[PDB]
Structure formats: structure tokens, C-alpha cells
Design a binder for these strands. Structure first.
Ligand code: FES
Ligand SMILES: [Zn+2]
Lengths: 85, 37, 175, 157, 198, 161, 60, 27
RNA sequence: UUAACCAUUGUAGGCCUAAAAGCAGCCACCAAUAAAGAAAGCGUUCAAGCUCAACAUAAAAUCAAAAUUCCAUAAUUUA
């Protein structure tokens, strides 16, 4: 029931790892199949930009999540409550 | 709820709690497994 | 949904073993066998071939087939219609290395389950393991006399097994 | 200490934390209780020590954050229950979700309370001199505390 | 990178042909009132049931052990033997015969290419149904059991002990003691064994 | 059935009860005993050589995160990469740390964190790596070194051209 | 199928099995045999560990 | 019947007196 | 030890079994895979199918002294 899920982060900088783990959970074959409406995409960059997660819904609601100080579980917790709408 | 002298988990989903002064095993999958001490 | 089967090309309609399973999903069994029969014509008839039919959400047939099975061929190579009923010490197959290597080379050509292992050592050992699974002992090389003596021993043993079958049949009759 | 702020866009901001008093009296102690020589010298009455391990709404903090050993984590947890039941933590009361008010039933004063008052049944057959049923006071977990009495503390009243 | 060790090798343990427990013929006060002097050694097997009290095992218990133990043991890998005699002591209202057992006796012995954990459950279950208190002990556990007992005596911090007071008649205590108490030293009372008593 | 003991006997039992010796300080509260010399199991030493071998053999080492994609789908990627004669390597990170701590490559330690996969080959078909990466969109690339030169994904893209 | 000792020992039965195509070493290494520091050694020991775990897990 | 604290001590005191009696009868 | 995750493939492997494919039956009990039992419990027209062990990343650490009507009052620390 999710239109699209976008995650961006800086690999070589030693910073938040929750976003990377959160991407792994998002990039799960079971999860991807269940929410078949979404095509998961992962991208990387070098700039001093804190990791940012962008979620797109068909209704137009956009949920942006930064792992800067959020743990991976809290990321998923926010999603599920938002997914329920 | 069967009240038994010794309580034993009966399946994977069975879990244990301490309610109102006694030990309970409660199973979400199978209500038959509910037990009290 | 992918459905496995080891059916032989010669007979394309097993029926109860697969038809109702396929029917439970809901398909035309005759259509399944006919395309299987098309593959039967391409292959020599009466030899098992692994199949990987996929029943799509559209309820269509997507047949995928592979080379002849190792287990049946090893039985065929050993000339065993029905394999040894114990296989712990009952050996009905005595295979030379040259036969083992040649057949293994043919084996490593399917992609479905990735028999693409570069070293033939893997494939040869894989078929040797199948031989161990079956009542077959993989000899390095055998003499024709040993096969004749072994065949004579097997015939005597099979005669004893037939006597054992007669004893079992007599016991079954009593039961 | 990080707090989550929502806007949807939500982000967590890390804030500076108050620092522990430096130079513990007993360095090389694993548990924070033993780096200050408090192994057997605290009870439910010591709100100042107990409060440090408590969430703002009265819950115990996880062991992996406090760093306490299991033996002392259980003692702190039990002491906190007794402290809550004694009304010594008026500012760590449970949060009221919505449309809920405190029971308004008058509060009975209690201390050294082992069990939750809700689930303890009355002793209707108290028993005679030698079969007397005992009313438990205190916690067994604190049986090793330093005692300044001639005889050990009377747990069963 | 989970670490691992070579699996314990029981290859040395041969399997007796008659692995299953044999049958027991139903027909062929101090007997249970003291420490045992028989069957206390493991011998061939590594796992056995330890009698922690004094009791009589009549034919009914023998069958329960027989049937339960026989069913689950694997002939290829497990075997068992009996460590106590068949019922021989008369009982009258000569109704039946009961085999006496003393605290410390090994009622039944098991062995084979199996770990204790595998045989823990059934032996404990079988023990629970025995008339006297019992337990399932491996070779290590019984050794540890004795070692702890000896360790307790050495490191005891109580100056006074039952043996010294009893033997020396301190306090005039032997007025209230039985002649057998001097030998037992307070460990054994009636048919009961007190492990915590040094 | 227990038979009541004479009170004098019961007094004797009470006074002769075992008393254990009590230490002044709990062993847990005390500093932990120093670890004895450890034993290397035949998993790190052999794998250590494998890490040594892959670095020695492969001039270019590029790192990408493990995607937890179905092994049935890993095979085709491995088969697709095998057709391009590019190999995949996966190793435990913790035993990879000591070499990466002291080796020619030491700034790649942040990359070698968590589930990961290694792009190893003998030829710098770096442009084709993107094509193999483009085959599966969701799989990302974290960085690494190509032709013994450490660079990030954005730099790799420019290097690929 | 072929049932001739001469053909069995001098011809390849399985090279070609299609209609158009006509008919044309020790025991598994023990932990002692396996080299202690070889991958072969540890991959069979791991299998032995699985065997032990399954054996223990049976009763629970 | 649990044995009282005072009862246990008074027996120990007497035992110590008799314990000394052993020493003085040994010479 | 018990906390996250995953489960591919030689092969539906010898066998009376209609069919039993790890898991009716009985048989031995090796292969590839960086990583996975010729299977440990589930499920079984039969199978597909639910997990445990495989791999990876993941934190901790032996037993405890019913029937007339309740029945002293009470009490945890001053040497
Ligand atoms: S008081 Fe030292 S371990 Fe907790
Ligand atoms: Zn249940």
C-alpha cells in the first residue's frame, strides 16, 4: 500500500547505521512482495548530507525520515502507524 | 482455563505472565493452552 | 506457483498423482500433457525429465524441463528395473570410471538448478553421491569376468530374494 | 539524550546530558552501585539513588543502559515498586492517556509493601500461635542489607 | 563466526546385543534405614537413576521402568541394565515380594553413544514415579555430588558438629540418641537422607 | 512418614547446621580476571589467508551492501557476473578488521561494516559493473577501490567514463 | 537398456540418450583423514555439529 | 517446633564449658 | 546457552508403497554452494507446505532453609 520508498545516505562517512539497516529491512523480498505497489530504490552520495529517507504515497502524503539520530526500530514504527492511515 | 498444579508451555506461541497473584500461560493461537496455577 | 514432477516423457498423464493437484489450482490437464508430449517428441521417449511448471496468477502453463535425471539413468546404466531393497550392502550396479565421467559431462548443462559448476569433479562426485543413495557402488573399473561373476552372484541372491519374497508372500497369505 | 520532533517530516535531536560526579570513591567497580560503595546500604526510602534509574513516568530503565548487574538491577526494581507504593515519587505518576482522571479514591498510607495491594487476598483464618499466617513485610531481595539490630529483621509480621 | 568443537566421540562404547531391559519375575526394617553399600558404582553405563531415599520397589514399579525405558531407547545407539535384584522379601496381609533399596543405590543404569541431555527427560520422568525420592545423575553429576559433600565438610565454619557431640557424649546427649546415630552422624533419619546435613 | 524428634535432639540438629564461608567482596563486583591466551580456531587462520589471497590476487576491490535478496536471485546475479568473469566474495567483518586496520587499505573500514558483498576481479570492467548493478535497480553500491585506488561511488561513476 | 558386459565396459551409455543418438575414489574423508586447517575438514565437522544438535533436539 | 535463638545459644555456652573440661582432664 | 535473520540446490535419492519427495514405509546417509541435516519437530489425497539447526550480522551469563465465631495486641534497625 506504499507508492514508493526512497533512501539516500553517505556510505564512506562513518555515521548513522540505522538508515543502512533500515534500507535492508525495506529491501526485503518478503516485504517488497507484500507491498508490491512500491519499487524500492537505493542511492548513495559523497556530500556532507545526513542520511534521509523519503516515502511517497499515492494520496500525496510524503513521509521523510532522517536516520541522523533515529534508531532503525523507530523508523519502522513510524512507518507502520503512517501506513495504517 | 484449566487450573493445574504445575504449568507447562504447550506450543511455541505460548507465553507466561503473572496476573492477580498467580502464574498464567496464555496462547494466542490455541485458547485451549490457557492455564492457571 | 511452481510445481515439481519427475514424470517420464513416455506417459504424459499420470492422473491422480498430479492431475488433481493441478486441478485443485484449476487447469486443463490435457493441455499440460500435450505440451509435455511436445517435449516428449524432442527427447527420447520413456525417460524421466525434471519439470518446473509454473501456474501463473493468470492460470496459464509455463513448462520448463531439464536433462535426464541422474538417479534413473544410474539405475538404467546398472540395468536395475527395481533398485536394491536394502542398498546398505546390496549392490546391483558396477560402473567404470569412464562411464561415470562421460555421463557427468552431459549432466552439467542445465541452468534451472545451476549444474553450471565449472569443475567436473563436483558433478562427478554429485552423481557418485546419487549412486550411494541408490543401491549402486561406483567402481573405478571392472573386469567383464567380475561382472559375469557378480551377475551370477546377483542372480543367485535375487533367487534367494525371490525365495524371501515367496516367504513374505506366504506370510502375507496367512495374514 | 535524543528527542523526536515531528512536522510529514520527523527528526531526532541529541541534547547534552548531565554528567556523573567525577572520581568515584571505589574505581574498578563494574556496577555503578559498587563504584560508590552502595552494595548493601540502600532501601526503598532512598529516592535520590532510586530516582536516577527511573523513566519520567515511573518505569525502570533497561539494564543495558544503567549498567547495573542483575543482582542490583532486581534490587533497584523492587525498591522502586515499594517506593511507588509508598507515595515517595509524586512526580513520576503514570501518564493519563485521554479522558482519564485519577481514581479519586482516598489513598491509604503504606510502606515496605512487597506485593501490589490489588491482588493480595485477606487472611480470614489467621491461625493460632504455631500455625499463625504471616503478613509479609519488606522484600526477600534485600535480605543481605546491613542490619543494625541485635537480631535479623522481622520479615513476616 | 560461531565457534565449534569436535563432536564427542562415543566410538569406544560398544552396544550389547540385549540392549533392551530384561523381564523381571514377579515370583522368584533396616533394609532401607541406612546408607547403601551396593550398586553405588556406575560400572559399564554412564547414566543411571540415583535413589535419594529408602523405599520398597515392588513388581509394579519394575514394569513401569521396563516399559517406559524400553520404548524410547534406540537399539543401535543405546542400552540399559538392571542394578538391583528381583523381588525376594515376603509381604503378608505372602501377598507379594518387594525389593528393598537404600539411599544412594543406583536403581537402573543406561549407556550408549548418547549425551546425558538426551536421556535427562525420560529418566527424570521415570524417577518421579518411583516410590522413594530419586534423581537422574550422569557420571559427572554423581562425582560432583560427592565432591560438593566433601567440600562442604572441609570448609564448614561451624565449630560444633553432630559427630563430635555424639561421640563424646557432650551435653549428655546420648540419652536422647539411638545407638545407630553415632554411625550415621545425623545425615540419615529413619528412611530419609538429608543431603544438607554435614 | 517423619516421626517427631525429641526436642533435645532437635536442638542438637539446629546448632550443628552447616555454615558456609562468606567472602568479604563478591567476585562479580571485583575486577574481572584477565583472559588467558586465546586459541585461534581453524576458521580465522584459514579465512585470514583467504582475505590475504583475495587482496593479493584481485587488484580492484569494490564494496557493496548485502541486499538480502533471495538466493535463487543471487544465483542469476552470480551467473550473470560469472559470464562477465567478475566474482563475488563475502567474509565475516570482525576477522576482516585486523587486516584492514594494518594494510594498504585502511580508509575502507567504515565501508566494511554490517552485511556486505565484495566485488573482486582481475580486469577493471568498472563501467560494466554499473550495467550489472543496473540489472537489479534496488541494489546500491557503497564504494571501495578500483585498480588499487580508493574512491567513492560518485567518483567511480566519473572514473567509469 | 544395455545388458552386455562387452558393451557395458566399452561403450558410453549416457553420452547420447536422444532418439537420434545411439549408444556410443576412497570413502568420505574422516576427521582424522581431513587436514585440521582445511576447508574440507571444517565443513564436515559443521555437518557433524548439525547431527549432534539434531540428536539433542529430538527429545527437547 | 523451630528452635529459638536463646535456646540455641544456651546450649552452645554449656558445650564450651564442657569442651574446656576435656582439656583439663587431659594432663 | 538464548536473544536477530534466513532458508537454496545433485534428488520427487534406493523401497512392496497409487503415491509418498528430509519428514507413510524400510535404505544407506555422500555432492555442490562463502551457507545450508540425504532432516529435527510441524503439515501430509501424495506433495506443495511451517519452523529448528546452515551462513552472515546480535547481547547477555546450582538451587534456596469443613462443619457455633477469625482469634492476644502488635512490630521490619539505638549498639
Ligand atoms: S554492585 Fe558491583 S556488580 Fe553491581
Ligand atoms: Zn499454545
Amino acid at each position: 500500500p506504499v507508492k514508493l520508498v526512497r533512501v539516500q545516505f553517505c556510505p564512506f562517512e562513518k555515521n548513522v547505521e540505522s538508515t543502512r539497516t533500515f534500507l535492508q529491512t525495506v529491501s526485503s523480498e518478503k516485504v517488497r512482495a507484500t507491498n508490491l505497489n512500491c519499487s524500492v530504490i537505493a542511492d548513495v552520495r559523497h556530500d556532507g548530507s545526513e542520511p534521509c529517507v523519503d516515502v511517497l504515497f499515492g494520496d500525496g502524503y510524503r513521509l521523510i525520515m532522517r536516520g541522523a539520530h533515529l534508531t532503525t526500530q523507530e523508523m519502522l514504527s513510524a512507518l507502520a502507524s503512517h501506513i495504517r492511515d | 482455563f484449566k487450573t493445574k498444579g504445575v504449568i507447562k508451555k504447550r506450543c511455541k506461541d505460548c507465553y507466561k505472565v503473572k496476573r492477580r497473584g498467580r502464574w498464567f500461560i496464555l496462547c494466542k493461537t490455541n485458547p485451549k493452552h490457557k492455564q492457571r496455577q | 506457483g511452481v510445481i515439481r514432477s519427475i514424470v517420464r516423457a513416455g506417459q504424459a498423464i499420470p492422473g491422480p498423482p498430479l492431475g488433481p493437484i493441478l486441478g485443485q489450482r484449476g487447469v486443463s490437464i490435457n493441455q499440460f500433457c500435450k505440451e509435455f508430449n511436445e517435449k516428449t517428441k524432442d527427447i527420447k521417449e520413456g525417460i524421466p525429465l525434471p519439470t518446473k511448471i509454473f501456474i501463473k496468477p493468470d492460470r496459464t502453463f509455463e513448462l520448463k524441463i531439464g536433462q535426464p535425471t541422474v538417479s534413473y539413468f544410474l539405475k538404467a546404466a546398472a540395468g536395475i528395473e527395481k533398485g536394491a531393497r536394502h542398498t546398505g550392502k546390496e549392490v546391483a550396479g558396477l560402473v567404470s570410471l569412464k562411464h561415470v565421467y562421460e555421463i557427468a559431462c552431459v549432466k552439467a548443462k542445465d541452468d534451472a538448478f545451476a549444474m553450471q559448476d565449472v569443475p567436473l569433479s563436483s558433478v562427478v562426485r554429485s552423481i557418485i553421491g546419487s549412486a550411494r543413495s541408490l543401491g549402486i557402488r561406483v567402481v573405478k573399473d571392472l573386469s567383464a569376468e567380475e561382472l559375469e561373476a557378480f551377475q551370477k552372484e546377483r542372480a543367485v541372491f535375487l533367487a534367494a530374494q525371490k525365495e524371501a519374497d515367496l516367504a513374505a508372500q506366504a506370510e502375507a497369505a496367512k495374514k | 539524550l535524543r528527542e523526536v520532533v515531528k512536522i510529514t517530516v520527523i527528526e531526532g535531536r541529541i541534547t547534552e546530558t548531565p554528567k556523573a560526579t567525577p572520581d568515584p570513591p571505589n574505581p574498578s567497580g563494574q556496577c555503578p552501585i559498587c563504584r560508590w560503595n552502595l552494595k548493601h546500604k540502600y532501601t526503598y526510602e532512598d529516592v535520590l539513588l532510586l530516582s536516577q534509574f527511573i523513566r519520567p513516568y515511573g518505569g525502570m530503565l533497561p539494564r543495558r543502559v544503567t549498567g547495573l548487574c542483575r543482582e542490583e538491577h532486581r534490587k533497584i526494581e523492587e525498591c522502586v515498586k515499594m517506593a511507588h507504593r509508598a507515595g515517595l515519587l509524586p512526580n513520576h505518576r503514570p501518564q493519563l492517556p485521554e479522558g482519564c482522571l485519577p481514581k479519586d479514591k482516598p489513598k491509604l498510607n503504606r510502606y515496605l509493601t512487597r506485593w501490589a495491594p490489588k491482588s493480595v487476598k485477606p487472611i480470614y483464618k489467621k491461625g493460632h500461635r504455631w500455625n499463625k499466617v504471616g503478613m509479609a513485610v519488606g522484600s526477600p531481595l534485600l535480605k543481605d542489607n546491613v542490619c543494625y539490630s541485635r537480631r535479623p529483621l522481622k520479615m513476616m509480621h | 563466526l560461531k565457534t565449534l568443537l569436535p563432536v564427542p566421540t562415543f566410538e569406544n562404547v560398544s552396544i550389547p546385543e540385549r540392549s533392551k531391559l530384561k523381564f523381571v519375575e514377579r515370583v522368584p526394617l533396616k533394609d532401607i534405614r541406612g546408607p547403601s553399600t551396593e550398586a553405588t558404582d556406575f560400572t559399564e553405563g554412564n547414566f543411571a537413576i540415583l535413589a535419594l531415599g529408602g523405599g520398597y520397589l515392588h513388581w509394579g514399579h519394575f514394569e513401569m521402568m521396563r516399559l517406559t525405558i524400553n520404548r524410547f531407547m534406540d537399539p543401535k545407539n543405546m542400552f540399559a541394565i538392571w542394578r538391583v535384584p528381583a523381588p525376594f522379601k515376603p509381604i503378608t496381609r505372602i501377598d507379594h515380594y518387594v525389593t528393598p533399596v537404600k539411599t544412594g543405590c543406583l536403581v537402573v543404569e543406561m549407556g550408549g553413544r548418547c549425551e546425558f541431555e538426551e536421556v535427562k527427560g525420560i529418566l527424570n520422568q521415570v524417577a518421579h514415579k518411583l516410590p522413594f525420592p530419586a534423581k537422574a545423575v550422569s557420571r559427572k553429576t554423581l562425582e560432583r555430588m560427592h565432591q560438593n559433600q566433601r567440600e562442604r565438610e572441609l570448609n564448614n565454619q561451624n565449630p560444633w558438629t553432630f559427630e563430635h557431640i555424639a561421640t563424646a557424649n557432650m551435653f549428655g546427649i546420648r540419652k536422647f540418641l539411638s545407638p545407630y546415630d553415632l554411625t550415621q552422624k545425623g545425615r540419615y533419619w529413619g528412611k530419609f537422607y538429608m543431603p544438607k546435613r554435614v | 512418614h517423619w516421626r517427631v524428634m525429641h526436642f533435645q535432639r532437635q536442638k542438637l540438629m539446629a546448632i550443628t547446621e552447616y555454615i558456609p564461608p562468606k567472602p568479604a567482596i563478591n567476585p562479580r563486583c571485583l575486577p574481572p580476571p584477565p583472559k588467558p591466551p586465546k586459541e585461534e580456531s581453524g576458521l580465522v587462520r584459514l579465512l585470514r589467508q583467504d582475505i590475504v589471497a583475495v587482496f593479493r590476487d584481485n587488484r580492484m576491490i569494490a564494496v557493496c551492501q548485502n541486499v538480502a535478496l533471495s538466493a535463487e536471485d543471487k544465483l542469476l546475479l552470480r551467473h550473470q557476473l560469472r559470464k562477465h568473469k567478475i566474482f563475488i566474495k563475502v567474509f565475516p567483518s570482525q576477522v576482516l578488521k585486523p587486516f584492514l586496520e594494518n594494510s594498504k587499505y585502511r580508509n575502507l573500514l567504515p565501508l566494511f561494516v554490517g552485511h556486505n558483498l565484495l566485488l573482486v576481479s582481475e580486469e577493471p570492467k568498472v563501467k560494466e559493473m554499473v550495467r550489472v548493478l543496473k540489472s537489479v535497480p534496488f541494489l546500491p553500491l557503497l564504494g571501495g577501490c578500483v585498480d588499487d585506488t580508493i574512491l567513492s561511488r560518485q567518483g567511480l561513476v566519473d572514473y567509469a567514463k | 537398456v544395455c545388458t552386455d558386459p562387452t558393451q557395458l565396459t566399452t561403450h558410453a551409455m549416457g553420452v547420447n540418450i536422444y532418439k537420434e543418438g545411439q549408444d556410443v575414489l576412497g570413502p568420505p574423508k574422516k576427521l582424522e583423514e581431513l587436514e585440521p586447517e582445511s576447508r574440507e575438514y571444517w565443513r564436515l565437522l559443521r555437518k557433524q555439529n548439525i547431527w549432534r544438535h539434531n540428536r539433542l533436539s529430538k527429545n527437547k | 517446633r523451630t528452635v529459638s535463638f536463646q535456646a540455641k545459644e544456651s546450649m552452645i555456652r554449656r558445650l564450651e564449658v564442657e569442651a574446656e573440661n576435656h582439656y583439663w582432664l587431659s594432663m
